[PDB]
Design a protein around this nucleic acid. Structure first.
Ligand SMILES: [Mg+2]
Ligand SMILES: [Mg+2]
Ligand SMILES: [Mg+2]
Ligand SMILES: [Mg+2]
Ligand SMILES: [Mg+2]
Ligand SMILES: [Mg+2]
Ligand SMILES: [Mg+2]
Ligand SMILES: [Mg+2]
Ligand SMILES: [Mg+2]
Ligand SMILES: [Mg+2]
Ligand SMILES: [Mg+2]
Ligand SMILES: [Mg+2]
Ligand SMILES: [Mg+2]
Ligand SMILES: [Mg+2]
Ligand SMILES: [Mg+2]
Ligand SMILES: [Mg+2]
Ligand SMILES: [Mg+2]
Ligand SMILES: [Mg+2]
Ligand SMILES: [Mg+2]
Ligand SMILES: [Mg+2]
Ligand SMILES: [Mg+2]
Ligand SMILES: [Mg+2]
Ligand SMILES: [Mg+2]
Ligand SMILES: [Mg+2]
Ligand SMILES: [Mg+2]
Ligand SMILES: [Mg+2]
Ligand SMILES: [Mg+2]
Ligand SMILES: [Mg+2]
Ligand SMILES: [Mg+2]
Ligand SMILES: [Mg+2]
Ligand SMILES: [Mg+2]
Ligand SMILES: [Mg+2]
Ligand SMILES: [Mg+2]
Lengths: 258, 134, 158
RNA sequence: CGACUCUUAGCGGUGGAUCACUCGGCUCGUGCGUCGAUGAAGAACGCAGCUAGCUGCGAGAAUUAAUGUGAAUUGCAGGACACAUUGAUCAUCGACACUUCGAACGCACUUGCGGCCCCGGGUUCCUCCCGGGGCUACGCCUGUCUGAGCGUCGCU
RNA sequence: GCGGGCCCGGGUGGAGCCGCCGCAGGUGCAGAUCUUGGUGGUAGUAGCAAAUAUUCAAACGAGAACUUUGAAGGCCGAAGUGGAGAAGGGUUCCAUGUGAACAGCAGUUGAACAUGGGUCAGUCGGUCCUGAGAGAUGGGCGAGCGCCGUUCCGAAGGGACGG
RNA sequence: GGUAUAGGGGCGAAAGACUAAUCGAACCAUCUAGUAGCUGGUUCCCUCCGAAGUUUCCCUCAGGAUAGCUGGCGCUCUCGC
RNA sequence: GACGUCGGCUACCCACCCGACCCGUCUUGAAACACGGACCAAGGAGUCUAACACGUGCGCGAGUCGGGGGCUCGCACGAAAGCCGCCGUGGCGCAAUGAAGGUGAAGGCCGGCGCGCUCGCCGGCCGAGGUGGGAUCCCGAGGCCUCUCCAGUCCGCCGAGGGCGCACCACCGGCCCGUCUCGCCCGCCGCGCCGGGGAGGUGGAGCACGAGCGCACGUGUUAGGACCCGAAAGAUGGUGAACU
RNA sequence: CGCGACCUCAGAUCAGACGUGGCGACCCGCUGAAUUUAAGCAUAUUAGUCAGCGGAGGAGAAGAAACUAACCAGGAUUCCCUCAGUAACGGCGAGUGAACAGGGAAGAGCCCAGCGCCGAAUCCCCGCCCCGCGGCGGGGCGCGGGACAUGUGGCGUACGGAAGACCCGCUCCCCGGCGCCGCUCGUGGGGGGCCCAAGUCCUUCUGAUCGAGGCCCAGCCCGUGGACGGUGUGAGGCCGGUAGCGGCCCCCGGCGCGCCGGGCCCGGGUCUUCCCGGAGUCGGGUUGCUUGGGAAUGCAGCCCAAAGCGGGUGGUAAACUCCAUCUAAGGCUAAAUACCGGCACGAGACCGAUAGUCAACAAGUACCGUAAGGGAAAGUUGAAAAGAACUUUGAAGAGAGAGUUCAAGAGGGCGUGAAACCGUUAAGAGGUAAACGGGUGGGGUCCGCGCAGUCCGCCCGGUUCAACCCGGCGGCGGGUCCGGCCGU
């Protein structure tokens, strides 16, 4: 916000009618340039901005807990479906399996060389290569506001418990580390886009059913929560349209252009 | 990534600290790397430049393999003057061309008691660090 | 000016309310400071409960509730006399004592006396000096636990 | 085809718009949260080899001492230092120092007039005179000393 | 491309910039006798006309109507265009030098600019006294900063001689 | 020359005169971005729809409320099936 | 027709024919002898908070919620995010009506007991009444046929006609609370200035098998400076008699 | 006729201390409006707000019921949510508007007067001795002084207390010093100082790389370090830093150990006997202000003016009658709370020199007014001054050559350099002011051809493998579901 005193620190009175001036408050007296000039107006030099910004703007917004869980579940489900991950731009071509789950020994890593070797073995290093190729200077006033460097977001690593894995996967650009019990939608869906490539750990992967549960079981870690129900089950429209049951109850189409 | 909540990490503030540093801090700022032979011998990465060292220019117009003595250290301008790194003025007067210490490699140190103490401290700290690494 | 069936509203913004606007950007910092102070206070009294002294059983007035049971300020002097604890000694062992609370019903008196007896049963009175004087518990039940008691002592359940 | 005038273009003028830069602001948050009669805030006057302003300093006046670091400051000369030496500059700063007004304190505000003690010049305390040093404001508490009362009493 | 505008070519420029999917706003100017800054016609125009008046020769000087010197003609005509002060000004005073800017023409001149220099008290005044008046203490008032009042509801002289 | 009278106050041989170029109530700062049913202005394109100056009430007549005129969003149905 | 010749709607200049008054604003009426306007560049005016109403999107749903607090990080990304016997203290909704003392939403049918007395009491049954219009669904005679005559289960379209009838509308009934009139009976711990029930009108923002809660977006009305600029005024505290 | 005590009252350059002023963002005590709204306006609202005065601290104030309630009761104060835009107030208009309970943050209780018991058992000052003395204390020795009986100290205060009787088990807390080991959570408490990884590798651009290509795996090495800044562009590895339960060197703070000087003969339960309360105060009338408080919520000037199974409260005034709840008119106290000023840090979906504080710069500066006060404009050469030597015309300002630089087509208010406006050059035109819309024509500017541009793309006529077999590899679909898994 701007200062409350901005523009009103002067003592300016408007010269009355009968003078060539245009009825604007002007600086009183003095032998200065800033004398009989103009103040208190949004159109005047110095002046005061129209509707000055206030600190008590509604900066923070509120979202329902159930909707937040819905969104995080949708993002987690969209972490599958390699088409969506490819649509996010992640170089996932050579990854052996998109639901990439790795052993629990990764938490025991404590050096960056082990982390990069594991990433190359899993063939997820191409994402880091793309992140490296994406490093450049930001355009605009952000450079002088501690936002000079920008780069592409890379793969996300989800672990069950912290045993030094973060320090290993800390100096690799683009890698974000999340815990299963405190998954963040802001990092699972960067930019509001539901696609994201994630690397799972076996314990973290097994904890997913304990975190949210299935449709026939409760979460067992959230007091009252179940997975949302599907509005439609057979999502494949092409299979439904050409099904024999539908085709038996259709008229002959008219495609003769007149 | 920096984690200490008492470091600057601010563009304007870091620039202000750099350009308003006192003389003793500017001495540490004006540091130059040692040669490969000196790095192997003393096990020291770099040392602050001094008035009586031998200097090779690594970058710039005067880049070359020549070895020149330091003439003076100008801490106000963050620059040093070298022996043969000089230019001719309009009237024929010779003027030293300033070379930043970061673009300079030391090939021979001016060893005094304090220089030896600094070398020993740096070597011992590096040894402690590598022992911690192992 | 009214216009085709709106509510009649009387906002209380006729004073200079913008002068006394209280923002809440201090809320997370306040919570962090409170948590740090709470942890420091818990660490200062290493074996004593972090919640504090034991609280009595209290029933609420104002027939609206009339049935809930909450924690009181302290045990009345009659309850201490029945349980056999000196009022001045009790505050030094972690028992809340207040002298204003009356005692009308026998049921509340008996419930609080039983609560005091139960608290005394599960109490580990450390010796004043390394040598064990009278009323001090054995060294067997001193190394077995020296940790805080998270949450309220003997939580009240309706 | 002249001169003048009108439009467009190239170049050259007045002007400083736009863009990119920023040791500056605005907003939020954290810790701490400390002035003064042992003289505060503020003001005046002075202090550098060459010095106007800003900043810093107080007749020890661009800084003294001590600690840490360790070879400069620099616009020019001069140089102190031997940088194998508490040792140049810097930062810290705990020792010392800190002109005149100002709650401002001998009386007033002119920088004018005084009183009480000590020392020196003059003397051989001799008072004039000169210089230096320490005191001399209001209110108030405890205590001391000297006092007043046709206040209340006791002896003669 | 109906349009809001946009994409390329050339020149200058020297260090950052844009498209797409979403988010947010101090987000689009022809006017408000709008605010700030700059520039035209007017216009080489109005004007450089209150108080009688200048001329000759020489010198310095690149340069002379305006400087200096000499001569001539004039005016102010002792309630002066003379000689000294008070208030005010504050270096404007003096010597040397420059002619960037100012002295509404010019200048070799200046109260301009740059270097230096200059104010000497027992007797001349402040300092002393009181006037009209102002203003403490005592006293009274006042929520309070303070105010009333100058002898009024005061144990108000700390001085002196002789012993 | 010194001194005294200071703003709903002073002073006035009296003109509402003077009170620092302002006096039928000085100047400075703040309340204050005082209020205005009254003037002036109110910033890109295209497409579609498209008015009223009329009834009643109001210390109401240069203004409002209320009906009327307008736009947008729909919904319930019928059908050149 | 092809080495000084081609195509270039739009823009550079000029000419000709026709048309053609300077923009913005108040206004019934502006080119006006109505007001603002020399020219250029930059800045410049419907914003934010809170309260409502409606519409729209999302999640849950007779429930919904995160206010505040607490547990995880030493804040890079974070003052975020995740969680809570706090999952609900508490708000909103699920019940309304009277000033209040208070009361407070279902009836109908069948057989019996009092005289079925449109009144009271016993057992069983159906469980938001009925009428009209009602999108859609059910039955559906029969027809259309099929290379010849008959029989014929099957895949069809139309299908007169007959029904169950969403949502909603209109009406007739029913129930709840206040009030008015006429009345007959029921119960007791205390038999009373006790309490309860009926019929017929009327008043209510009600019930009659529910729809809200939270978040976000837009519009409209307000309190705030409130689209921007503009007074003649009023109050508080201080400075001036160097003019007069 | 004086002296000696006491009570009231003066003088001190008497001995030793204390207050004065400043800041004032947050806090406490007073005083205290009008703009504005009510479409006018006088009660109301603005508003216990601004202005004015006084007084502190790191917080302040408040604070342990003369309380809330009427319930099966709760239990100091402060703050958050809710209560609640509710009860209530109000030309009952505009508008104003709490409290209780409930959930939390924090949580800590106490001391006098009086009543009474102890030989004043109490306190201050001066002298000497011992310790330490830079936030002047402890002990001892002084017929050394003073204060105090017009009352100091010990026990003891509403939750009862004191003294005896005799039931029960037994004897460590605090203050001032002397030193000592553990370096005491942001994972070593606070402050300061010195240090700890890896390319200037090979070509290639450039004035200069930090650019581009490549280097046992995105490439060479480090990575618990890939933040940031500087270095002649755009640097993880050139430099400072960055990460680290990383190191070393000093000071300070805090918790614990042994010693010395000390102070300290300190209980619970029952019974018995006594004792136990703050006066011009409560309360009443009154009037003024204030409040939601309405026959009067609180604060008050004046008058009246108490009692002790009394007094206060129980939200409608009064009488009678029972109930419930506290004990006013004396005092202290941290925590959860606030912080547009001061000291030192961190951050940003904020502005980017007419913006952002008035002030990015010698800014509360220059300058204006007698004064209270008013108050600006103003950033950018270049990587490096390498800031143009020298020759020539001019008195000089100014030019012409030369030189530096990648570039002065960057020359000391010098980055980029628009429009208004001006000079000149090239072209066109010109007696109905200029300018504008529609339609053509003429002349220029370059653009795209072309020395024909006759444009191609399929089918047809005039050196090896497809056809067809062998082997291998991979894939598609199928059902006897052939068999198992998978799966409703
Ligand atoms: Mg708690
Ligand atoms: Mg003329
Ligand atoms: Mg005459
Ligand atoms: Mg004269
Ligand atoms: Mg002169
Ligand atoms: Mg002139
Ligand atoms: Mg008259
Ligand atoms: Mg306005
Ligand atoms: Mg009107
Ligand atoms: Mg329409
Ligand atoms: Mg139309
Ligand atoms: Mg009009
Ligand atoms: Mg008219
Ligand atoms: Mg018009
Ligand atoms: Mg005009
Ligand atoms: Mg603009
Ligand atoms: Mg509406
Ligand atoms: Mg105004
Ligand atoms: Mg008035
Ligand atoms: Mg009004
Ligand atoms: Mg009005
Ligand atoms: Mg009015
Ligand atoms: Mg009021
Ligand atoms: Mg207190
Ligand atoms: Mg309470
Ligand atoms: Mg409500
Ligand atoms: Mg006593
Ligand atoms: Mg850089
Ligand atoms: Mg870098
Ligand atoms: Mg390094
Ligand atoms: Mg009553
Ligand atoms: Mg500015
Ligand atoms: Mg330029």
């Amino acid at each position: 916000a701007v200062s409350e005193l901005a523009g009103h620190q002067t003592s300016a009175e408007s010269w009355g009618t009968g003078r060539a001036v245009a009825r604007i408050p002007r600086v009183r007296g003095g032998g200065t340039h800033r004398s009989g000039q103009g103040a208190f107006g949004n159109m005047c030099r110095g002046g005061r901005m129209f509707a000055p910004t206030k600190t008590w703007r509604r900066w923070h917004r509120r979202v329902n807990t159930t909707q937040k869980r819905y969104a995080i579940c949708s993002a987690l489900a969209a972490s599958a479906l390699p088409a969506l991950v490819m649509s996010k731009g992640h170089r996932i071509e050579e990854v052996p399996e998109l639901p990439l789950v790795v052993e629990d020994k990764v938490e025991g890593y404590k050096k960056t060389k082990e982390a990069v070797l594991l990433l190359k073995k899993l063939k997820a290093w191409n994402d880091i290569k793309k992140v490296y190729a994406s490093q450049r200077m930001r355009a605009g006033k952000g450079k002088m506001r501690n936002r000079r460097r920008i780069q592409r977001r890379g793969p996300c690593v989800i672990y069950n418990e912290d045993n030094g894995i973060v320090k290993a996967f800390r100096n690799i650009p683009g890698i974000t580390l999340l815990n299963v019990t405190k998954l963040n939608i802001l990092k699972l869906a960067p930019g509001g886009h539901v696609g994201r490539f994630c690397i799972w750990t076996e314990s973290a992967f097994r904890k997913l059913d304990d975190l949210y549960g299935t449709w026939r079981k409760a979460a067992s870690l959230k007091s009252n929560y179940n997975l949302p129900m599907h509005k439609m089950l057979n999502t494949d429209l092409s299979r439904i349209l050409k099904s024999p049951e539908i085709q038996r109850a259709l008229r002959a189409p008219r495609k003769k252009i007149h | 990534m920096k984690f200490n909540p008492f470091v600057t990490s601010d563009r304007s503030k870091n620039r202000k600290r750099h350009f308003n540093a006192p003389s003793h801090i500017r001495r540490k700022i004006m540091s130059s790397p040692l040669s490969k032979e000196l790095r192997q011998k003393y096990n020291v990465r770099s040392m602050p430049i001094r008035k009586d060292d031998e200097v090779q220019v690594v970058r710039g117009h005067y880049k070359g393999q020549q070895i020149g003595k330091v003439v003076q250290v100008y801490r106000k301008k963050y620059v040093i003057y070298i022996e043969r790194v000089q230019r001719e003025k309009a009237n024929g007067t010779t003027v030293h061309v300033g070379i930043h210490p970061s673009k300079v490699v030391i090939t021979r140190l001016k060893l005094d008691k304090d220089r030896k103490k600094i070398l020993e401290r740096k070597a011992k700290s590096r040894q402690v660090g590598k022992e911690k690494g192992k | 000016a009214p216009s085709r069936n709106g509510m009649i509203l009387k906002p209380h913004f006729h004073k200079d309310w913008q002068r006394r606007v209280a923002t809440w950007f201090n809320q997370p910092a306040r919570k962090i400071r409170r948590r740090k102070a709470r942890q420091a206070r818990a660490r200062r009294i290493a074996p004593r409960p972090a919640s504090g002294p034991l609280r009595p059983i209290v029933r609420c007035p104002t027939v609206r509730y009339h049935t809930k049971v909450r924690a009181g300020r302290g045990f009345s002097l009659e309850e201490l006399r029945v349980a056999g604890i000196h009022k001045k000694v009790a505050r030094t062992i972690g028992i809340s004592v207040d002298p204003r609370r009356r005692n009308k019903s026998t049921e509340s008196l008996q419930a609080n006396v039983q609560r005091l007896k139960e608290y005394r049963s599960k109490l580990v009175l450390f010796p004043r000096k390394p040598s064990a004087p009278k009323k001090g518990d054995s060294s067997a039940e001193e190394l077995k636990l020296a940790t805080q008691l998270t949450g309220p002592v003997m939580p009240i359940r309706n």
